[PDB]
């Protein structure tokens, strides 16, 4: 069987497998316990143990498979790659690695890796890396998106088209839903874009809204909680992105939305032993760097392939840390959404500012139609307020849907 | 045959190039790999393997002729110049040299320059150095600035006419079509002034744009993505302007285009802590940006340097309204870019009473000065948006000097 199947097996079940397999009750026996005595027990007969795991090479060196349900913590059962099996088919971070294990030896409670059968869910001997794909202005395709939690997705779609890709910042301020808001677009592009991978990030989420983002957002949810290091929020980021950087080098298309690059910088301003130590604004000058690289590798790929992050960064939080690095992120991506909180102070859910929202590059993301029609948009919201504007595209948008809407306005 | 030349050609014909020249296996070796081999055993003969790259001589001495088509960066295609090489040639930062390169042995891990047969693109000892020759006030000889390209450029030369050696300064807020504009006058460049070099370079632009700008604009293009420290930043554009400044002392006119001398001043403050903030700025760190746009000058002894940057202003931060405020009034060129003016979606953007260039009369012709002043006063008491409604339905029934006699009819 494979490792990781022996982990997804409830303990009940899987020592009835273990009493006829030759072992004693181990009900005394923890649950990993159980998982290397049943290697043990198969080492009687040839190839009987597999596994799977996301790579992961660590600074000396060596390496070991890590688990994306677990979000890439440590343990245990992780599997260990040597120095050598690394080289021999020059692995990547990220690649995703499907091998036999060999059973362990006494005393190390390391799996040993022994040969590795798919890379990147292709054989053995496969490309081309994110920092070589030739980068367009991301705006080839357009990522589109009745209900009451579509009208979210309506006006999103209206005040700034994200596509493929594209690097989208949503700036929020306090109590402004962006958590509600994260959620509606998350399950949205996954029905209407389901060759597209989703990969939700959490950085400094509080361990309330991960469950909420593990049963509403409906993709891989890797998160990380402020009862963590923060060695760990920067250790699970690198991660996924890299793993999301294989992923478009294959054509395969991932939307990744951050929940925090605010905070995300934090981390890794703490991680840095302040190279500038100039810049006076609470973060070092040249740490900030480190945060630049997750927003900067997003791009849509000419040769085949997308990679869009949509991340949110904190404003008005009170503390300079916070308000410094959205200045330094201001004018790096080419999505700009504005939740302003007094249109929340009035209970309706979108609170966007339809004014400050816009995308650049519209005119290849958006028909010259649809284009035409946002521009008619735009005209009457330049002088309308936007606490006011908001409450008038929710009660109109919810009788008629998008173009509908334009068809009967056309009086 | 030249180092360059390999880089260029794709690499289904290097496969073959390496068969044939006696090597195996050759389709799974890396890209320079695949040209270290190829240029390894090109050594059975002297005088066969060629290279070319841009001199930057690092704060230690040893030089290296970086490639312009990463952007000076650095990496195993980097070609070794020994500090003994500087001294022969008294070489400087910037100067262009293309040598014969010997295949470096073991040992050493980098290519080596045998003998340099042009230096900025002449002989190899053919000097008069741009510091201290002597600067007008650069108004001798004017660039000239019909299409929907036109219209947008026509509106420059009627608003503040560009020259050679003029240190430009062209305020852009956000979402004013900054880019649009930059890429306009750069194409523009290219056809009406083909004898000056454009080099525009860009500071902490994103990834997306600088391969449209490579694309749109027809010469060497050199940028330097966010993605990248502050120190790469600085080392780009320490290029551009000495590589510049070295060109002009050969008697030829260079223009380059900053698409934010703000971002290069930010990058600036952060990576120097010599030991003063006035708004959260070092002020002894504004120097060296202020270095960058002082060079643009015209020369007397031959040349002009021009050096159009484009300032970023309203962006939010009160650090990028400061590097405006100490660059104001060192600047000869206005062109004032408006946020209100684009919202309106009216396309060139530009705010013209306030936009103007210093010296017109030495830039302009009599007879047309006398245009210049009637304009100035028809929309001198005109609004920002009423300025430019008035002078483009206008300007779109005849060209430049045509419109003159459209307004005295």
């Known amino acids: 069987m494979n490792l990781t199947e022996l982990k997804n097996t409830p303990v009940s079940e899987l020592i009835t497998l273990g009493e006829n397999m030759g072992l004693e009750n181990l009900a005394r026996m923890r649950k990993q316990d159980i998982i290397f005595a049943i290697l043990k027990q198969h080492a009687k007969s040839g190839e009987d143990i597999f596994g799977d795991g996301v790579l992961e090479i660590l600074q000396d060196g060596f390496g070991f498979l890590r688990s994306a349900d677990s979000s890439y913590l440590a343990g245990p059962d992780d599997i260990y790659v040597s120095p050598s099996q690394i080289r021999r088919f020059n692995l990547r971070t990220g690649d995703t690695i499907s091998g036999k294990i060999r059973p362990p030896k006494e005393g190390e409670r390391y799996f040993a890796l022994l040969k590795v059968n798919e890379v990147n869910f292709d054989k053995p001997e496969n490309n081309k890396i994110l920092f070589e794909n030739l980068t367009p202005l991301h705006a080839n395709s357009r990522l589109r998106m009745g209900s009451t939690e579509d009208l979210t997705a309506r006006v999103l779609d209206l005040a700034s088209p994200i596509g493929r890709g594209q690097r989208g910042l949503i700036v929020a301020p306090p109590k402004a839903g962006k958590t509600m808001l994260l959620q509606n677009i998350a399950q949205s592009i996954a029905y209407n874009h389901p060759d597209c991978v989703l990969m939700v990030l959490l950085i400094d989420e509080r361990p309330e809204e991960v469950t909420e983002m593990q049963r509403l957002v409906k993709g891989e949810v ?10 760990r929020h920067v250790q699970v980021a690198e991660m996924v992105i890299e793993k999301a950087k294989r992923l478009v080098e294959h054509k395969k298309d991932v939307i990744i939305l951050l929940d925090s690059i605010t905070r995300l910088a934090r981390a890794y301003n703490t991680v840095v032993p302040a190279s500038g130590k100039v810049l006076t604004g609470g973060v070092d000058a040249n740490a900030l760097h480190r945060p630049k690289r997750f927003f900067g590798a997003a791009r849509n790929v000419e040769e085949g392939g997308s990679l869009t992050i949509i991340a949110t960064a904190l404003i008005d939080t009170g503390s300079k840390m916070d308000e410094v690095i959205y200045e330094e992120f201001k004018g790096t991506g080419n999505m700009e959404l504005h939740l302003s909180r007094k249109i929340a ?12 929202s816009g995308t650049r590059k519209e005119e290849l993301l958006t028909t010259q139609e649809e284009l035409q029609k946002m521009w008619i948009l735009r005209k009457i919201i330049h002088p309308m307020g936007e606490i006011d504007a908001m409450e008038f595209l929710i009660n109109k948008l919810a009788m008629t849907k998008t173009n509908d809407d334009f068809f009967e306005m056309m009086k």
Request: overall charge negative.
């Open 222 to 231: 890797v998160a990380s909680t402020f009862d963590e290091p923060a060695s």
């Open 345 to 356: 102070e009035k209970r309706v859910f979108p609170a966007i500012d339809y004014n400050r």
